[PDB]
Design an enzyme around this catalytic site. Sequence first.
Site, PDB file in Angstrom:
ATOM      1  CB  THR A   1     -22.393  17.035  26.729  1.00 23.99           C
ATOM      2  OG1 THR A   1     -21.912  17.769  28.699  1.00 23.99           O
ATOM      3  CG2 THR A   1     -24.135  17.490  26.448  1.00 23.99           C
TER       4      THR A   1
ATOM      5  CB  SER B   1     -27.240  26.196  27.167  1.00 29.17           C
ATOM      6  OG  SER B   1     -26.240  26.390  28.092  1.00 29.17           O
TER       7      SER B   1
ATOM      8  CB  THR C   1     -19.129  26.308  24.822  1.00 29.62           C
ATOM      9  OG1 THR C   1     -17.846  25.564  23.969  1.00 29.62           O
ATOM     10  CG2 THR C   1     -20.386  26.858  24.406  1.00 29.62           C
TER      11      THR C   1
ATOM     12  CE1 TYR D   1     -21.892  23.188  24.120  1.00 31.83           C
ATOM     13  CE2 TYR D   1     -22.464  22.921  26.579  1.00 31.83           C
ATOM     14  CZ  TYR D   1     -22.945  23.475  25.044  1.00 31.83           C
ATOM     15  OH  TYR D   1     -23.438  24.996  25.237  1.00 31.83           O
TER      16      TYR D   1
ATOM     17  CB  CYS E   1     -18.113  17.016  29.881  1.00 35.61           C
ATOM     18  SG  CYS E   1     -18.857  18.018  28.334  1.00 35.61           S
TER      19      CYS E   1
HETATM   20  C1  LIG Z   1     -22.065  19.197  22.185  1.00 35.02           C
HETATM   21  C2  LIG Z   1     -23.206  18.951  22.635  1.00 35.02           C
HETATM   22  C3  LIG Z   1     -23.106  19.736  24.790  1.00 35.02           C
HETATM   23  C4  LIG Z   1     -24.469  18.575  22.380  1.00 35.02           C
HETATM   24  O1  LIG Z   1     -24.610  20.450  22.265  1.00 35.02           O
HETATM   25  P1  LIG Z   1     -25.107  21.782  20.814  1.00 35.02           P
HETATM   26  O2  LIG Z   1     -26.470  21.594  21.712  1.00 35.02           O
HETATM   27  O3  LIG Z   1     -25.626  21.600  19.321  1.00 35.02           O
HETATM   28  O4  LIG Z   1     -25.301  22.771  22.067  1.00 35.02           O
HETATM   29  P2  LIG Z   1     -25.209  24.238  20.080  1.00 35.02           P
HETATM   30  O5  LIG Z   1     -25.161  23.810  19.686  1.00 35.02           O
HETATM   31  O6  LIG Z   1     -26.472  24.659  21.164  1.00 35.02           O
HETATM   32  O7  LIG Z   1     -24.139  25.173  21.652  1.00 35.02           O
HETATM   33  C5  LIG Z   1     -23.255  25.379  20.001  1.00 35.02           C
HETATM   34  C6  LIG Z   1     -21.998  25.505  20.534  1.00 35.02           C
HETATM   35  O8  LIG Z   1     -21.474  24.891  20.908  1.00 35.02           O
HETATM   36  C7  LIG Z   1     -19.611  24.534  21.170  1.00 35.02           C
HETATM   37  N1  LIG Z   1     -19.037  23.488  20.979  1.00 35.02           N
HETATM   38  C8  LIG Z   1     -19.653  22.558  19.821  1.00 35.02           C
HETATM   39  N2  LIG Z   1     -19.089  21.347  20.233  1.00 35.02           N
HETATM   40  C9  LIG Z   1     -18.080  21.555  21.348  1.00 35.02           C
HETATM   41  C10 LIG Z   1     -17.437  20.373  21.639  1.00 35.02           C
HETATM   42  N3  LIG Z   1     -16.571  19.497  21.628  1.00 35.02           N
HETATM   43  N4  LIG Z   1     -16.345  21.192  23.284  1.00 35.02           N
HETATM   44  C11 LIG Z   1     -16.921  22.561  23.703  1.00 35.02           C
HETATM   45  N5  LIG Z   1     -18.167  23.170  23.136  1.00 35.02           N
HETATM   46  C12 LIG Z   1     -18.403  22.921  22.036  1.00 35.02           C
HETATM   47  C13 LIG Z   1     -20.054  26.068  20.300  1.00 35.02           C
HETATM   48  O9  LIG Z   1     -18.710  26.769  20.505  1.00 35.02           O
HETATM   49  C14 LIG Z   1     -21.159  26.639  19.979  1.00 35.02           C
HETATM   50  O10 LIG Z   1     -20.927  27.660  19.823  1.00 35.02           O
HETATM   51  P3  LIG Z   1     -20.936  28.248  18.086  1.00 35.02           P
HETATM   52  O11 LIG Z   1     -21.741  27.780  17.783  1.00 35.02           O
HETATM   53  O12 LIG Z   1     -22.866  29.270  18.619  1.00 35.02           O
HETATM   54  O13 LIG Z   1     -20.816  30.364  18.787  1.00 35.02           O
HETATM   55  C15 LIG Z   1     -22.488  17.435  23.178  1.00 35.02           C
HETATM   56  O14 LIG Z   1     -23.623  16.820  24.378  1.00 35.02           O
HETATM   57  C16 LIG Z   1     -22.385  15.962  21.514  1.00 35.02           C
HETATM   58  O15 LIG Z   1     -22.414  15.503  21.662  1.00 35.02           O
HETATM   59  N6  LIG Z   1     -21.906  17.079  20.766  1.00 35.02           N
HETATM   60  C17 LIG Z   1     -21.447  16.142  19.355  1.00 35.02           C
HETATM   61  C18 LIG Z   1     -21.623  17.395  18.039  1.00 35.02           C
HETATM   62  C19 LIG Z   1     -20.602  16.612  17.136  1.00 35.02           C
HETATM   63  O16 LIG Z   1     -20.892  15.730  16.935  1.00 35.02           O
HETATM   64  N7  LIG Z   1     -20.688  17.577  15.889  1.00 35.02           N
HETATM   65  C20 LIG Z   1     -20.132  17.769  14.939  1.00 35.02           C
HETATM   66  C21 LIG Z   1     -19.769  18.788  14.262  1.00 35.02           C
HETATM   67  S1  LIG Z   1     -19.002  18.043  12.737  1.00 35.02           S
END
Ligand SMILES: CC(C)(COP(=O)(O)OP(=O)(O)OC[C@H]1O[C@@H](n2cnc3c(N)ncnc32)[C@H](O)[C@@H]1OP(=O)(O)O)[C@@H](O)C(=O)NCCC(=O)NCCS
EC number: 2.3.1.-
Length: 91
Positions: free
Chosen positions: A38, A51, A78, A74, A72
């Site tokens: 994702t 989500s 989650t 995610y 995935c």
């Molecule tokens: C994660 C992704 C689905 C985008 O998600 P998003 O719109 O931010 O999802 P949200 O932030 O609303 O989700 C928040 C939740 O996702 C979860 N999440 C984040 N990274 C995840 C992972 N690698 N695997 C599973 N779940 C994860 C967390 O547990 C969080 O819950 P918490 O903060 O609320 O209690 C995905 O499409 C993506 O590519 N993410 C990249 C994220 C990233 O690079 N983060 C770097 C942080 S340094």
Amino acid sequence: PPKIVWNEGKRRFETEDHEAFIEYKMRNNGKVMDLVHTYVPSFKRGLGLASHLCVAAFEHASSHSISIIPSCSYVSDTFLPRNPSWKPLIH
Ligand SMILES: CC(C)(COP(=O)(O)OP(=O)(O)OC[C@H]1O[C@@H](n2cnc3c(N)ncnc32)[C@H](O)[C@@H]1OP(=O)(O)O)[C@@H](O)C(=O)NCCC(=O)NCCS
């Protein structure tokens, strides 16, 4: 609200702007949709957009009798623990 569309030939539902998306790989001759990755870019993170992408693949698979492989991390970590009622969608 917002809005998500199905980009079938790229095999993902994605934000109209193409930046946020959940990608899949179909399996079992159209009967299974494997949700493999994702993607939400930074600035858009933590607002439920992920989500929402999952909510787009699940409403879709569900309306067509296609079960889900939640590859995935995610999805089965989650999204599903928070949306158990989607669990009978799982292949
Ligand atoms: C994660 C992704 C689905 C985008 O998600 P998003 O719109 O931010 O999802 P949200 O932030 O609303 O989700 C928040 C939740 O996702 C979860 N999440 C984040 N990274 C995840 C992972 N690698 N695997 C599973 N779940 C994860 C967390 O547990 C969080 O819950 P918490 O903060 O609320 O209690 C995905 O499409 C993506 O590519 N993410 C990249 C994220 C990233 O690079 N983060 C770097 C942080 S340094």
